Amino acid sequence: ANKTVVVTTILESPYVMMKKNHEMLEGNERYEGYCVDLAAEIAKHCGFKYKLTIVGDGKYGARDADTKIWNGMVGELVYGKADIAIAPLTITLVREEVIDFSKPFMSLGISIMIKKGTPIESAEDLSKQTEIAYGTLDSGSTKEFFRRSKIAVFDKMWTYMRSAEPSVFVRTTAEGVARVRKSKGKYAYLLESTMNEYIEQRKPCDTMKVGGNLDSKGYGIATPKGSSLGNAVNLAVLKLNEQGLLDKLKNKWWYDKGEC
Amino acid sequence: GANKTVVVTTILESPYVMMKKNHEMLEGNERYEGYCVDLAAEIAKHCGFKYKLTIVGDGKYGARDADTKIWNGMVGELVYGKADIAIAPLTITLVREEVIDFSKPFMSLGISIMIKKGTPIESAEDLSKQTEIAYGTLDSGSTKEFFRRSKIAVFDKMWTYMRSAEPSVFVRTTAEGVARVRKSKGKYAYLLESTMNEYIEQRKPCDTMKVGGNLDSKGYGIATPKGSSLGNAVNLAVLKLNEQGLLDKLKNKWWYDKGECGS
Ligand SMILES: N[C@H](C(=O)O)[C@@H]1CC[C@@H]1C(=O)O
Ligand SMILES: N[C@H](C(=O)O)[C@@H]1CC[C@@H]1C(=O)O
Ligand SMILES: [Cl-]
Ligand SMILES: [Cl-]
Ligand SMILES: [Cl-]
């Protein structure tokens, strides 16, 4: 429909999740989460109607070295399939070069998730040993962070990870978490702190974040390069942050019921 | 002894019991809304008890396994002493009445047919006489048991096709039935209770409809363990709410007042 903004997003708790009973629901009402609420807020402030669509290949966005084709939500923006991406999408240099980003709406860093009791306290710890395997999501800013790093500990970790057998890489966050939970403390998962903290507060309460974050960065709302929508969306993010509304949303979707 | 909090077993089935929008930050009864949620509040008020709403663990209404003879679902919760009362769209049936107490019905209904708009079917007879349009029911519950037990030729004929169709024509939840009708381009019809049918008919994208008359006539009742002293009070409360017109007000509130398909 004319004037309808196509929003690309991704299923990632608690950002975007299928509602209970979603099978009888339709359109935007199928989904719930932090980014679903944020999308509604941004839309309201900028005065547009929008349609949420889950990205086809289920990926965030990387560029194939061979074909130099972008995939994921980044791909959707770059090739004109979506008008805006509203998701836990990390602002990185290589992405900033091909799409526009708002100022960040949330902060985060790469962190370590272990099964409770695992004798690891830091990235350094992981790097100095081999009994406990560790990996990341097979595509995204986290894996790219280790692949590009010239920092000693991270470089070591990467040279280990890219070769380890069987693969320490997983296809989804849920899959990474599952692997931590099944491996009796022999697998540690490298993921962004926001997801780590969410999962930490959920049953069966057998995982935990250890150490400080390995880096500091932010999620931004992304639009195609030079899109006129960019300006309004950026001012809207800043406005919502200043009203304390971004904080309210974090507190709502990371609200601790006491499962753990 | 002293008064205890009443444990209410119920089930997530729209618009009887639904998650409230901000459920993620709410606790206890406050997480839920809908017809049965309001009904529980009214019943508790007139009866003078405090209560806790609990969603049934296995997500079933109640059936007895032929093998083990164990009751599952909300009926099971009551039978095995896990809950004190069930407040849900629970169909009053012979096999259940044998093992639990039921109030007089708070709502009437009948098994019905839901089609995607434009499907060339207007009756169960129509369905039975063709094969192009598949049809099914929820894989457990009073609707499936109706066909499985029917001695009436048309329904026996529908059951004979349904039990052996492939892929399976049964669905696990009402939502799954609705999705199957909506996505199958007129090649799937869903057999469900007229109450759910009339509700979905008023929801976006307004692409379904109830066709034909009802296949039977029955009621939903409040259930309690057999012999429970709570039964008497709750029954009278249901009768009172009906005669005051409160039950009619509630159905209009949840079915029609905020229907999404026009006026
Ligand atoms: N924010 C990341 C991204 O933009 O690529 C996502 C979250 C999983 C994935 C990752 O951590 O690599
Ligand atoms: N009222 C029914 C019951 O008590 O079993 C429920 C509603 C879905 C299921 C059905 O239609 O069979
Ligand atoms: Cl669901
Ligand atoms: Cl108590
Ligand atoms: Cl009625």
Report the distance separating Cα A61 and Cα A55, nearest Å.
10
User: Could you tell me the two tokens for A100?
Assistant: 């526009």
List the Cα angle A247/A249/A250 in 5-degree steps.
Answer: 65
Q: How far apart are the CA of B206 and the centre of ligand 2, in A?
A: 23
Q: What are the residues facing A187 on neighbouring strands?
A: A133
Residue among B19, B27, B178 minimizing CB distance to A24: B178
- Residue whose Cα lies nearest atom 5 of ligand 1: it is A140
3-state helix, strand, coil in chain A (%, to 5): 35, 20, 40
How do strand B6-10 and strand B51-55 relate by DSSP bridges?
A: parallel
User: Could you tell me the two tokens for B128?
Assistant: 């039975």
Alpha-carbon B248 to chain mean position: 17
How is the beta sheet containing A222-224 ordered, strand by strand? A49-54, A4-9, A84-85, A222-224, A99-101
Report the distance separating Cα B218 and Cα B32, nearest Å.
27
Report the distance separating Cα B263 and Cα B261, nearest Å.
7
| Cross-chain residue pair B204–A26, CB shorter than 8 Å | yes
Q: What is the resolution of this structure in A?
A: 2.0
Every domain range in chain A assigned CATH 3.40.190.10 = 1-108+218-257, 109-217
Least Cα distance to B220 among B13, B31, B2, B1 occurs for B13
Best of B113, B143, B198 to mutate for ligand 2, by most ligand atoms within 8 A of CB? Answer: B143
User: Could you tell me the two tokens for A142?
Assistant: 């986290």
Structure solved via: X-ray
Q: How many residues does chain A have?
A: 260
CATH pick for B1-109+219-258 out of 3.40.190.10, 3.40.50.720, 3.40.50.2000, 3.30.9.10: 3.40.190.10
**H or E element in which residue A148 lies:** helix A141-148
| Residue-wise burial string across B134-151, b where 16 or more C-beta atoms lie within 10 A, e elsewhere | bbbbbbbbbbbbbbeebe
CB of A135 within 6 A of ligand 1: the answer is: no
| Cross-chain residue pair B179–A23, CB shorter than 8 Å | yes
The answer to whether the bond into B205 is cis (omega within 30° of 0) is yes
Q: B199 to chain A: nearest residue by CA? A: A24
Every domain range in chain B assigned CATH 3.40.190.10 = 1-109+219-258, 110-218
User: Could you tell me the two tokens for A105?
Assistant: 């709406």
Name the binding residues of B: 89, 91, 96, 142-143, 193
Could you tell me which residues come within 8 angstroms of residue B11 by beta carbon, excluding any fewer than 6 positions away? B17, B55, B56, B59, B60, B61, B74, B88, B89
Conformational region of residue A244, where left means phi above 0, alpha means psi within -120 to 50, and beta covers everything else: left
Residue B142 and residue B91 in contact, taking contact as beta carbons nearer than 8 Å: yes
CATH class of the region B110-218: alpha beta
Residue B133 and residue B119 in contact, taking contact as beta carbons nearer than 8 Å: yes
- Any idea which fold A1-108+218-257 has? D-Maltodextrin-Binding Protein; domain 2 (3.40.190)
Alpha-carbon A104 to chain mean position: 13
Task: Quote the DSSP letter at residue A67.
Answer: T
CATH homologous superfamily for the domain A109-217: Periplasmic binding protein-like II (3.40.190.10)
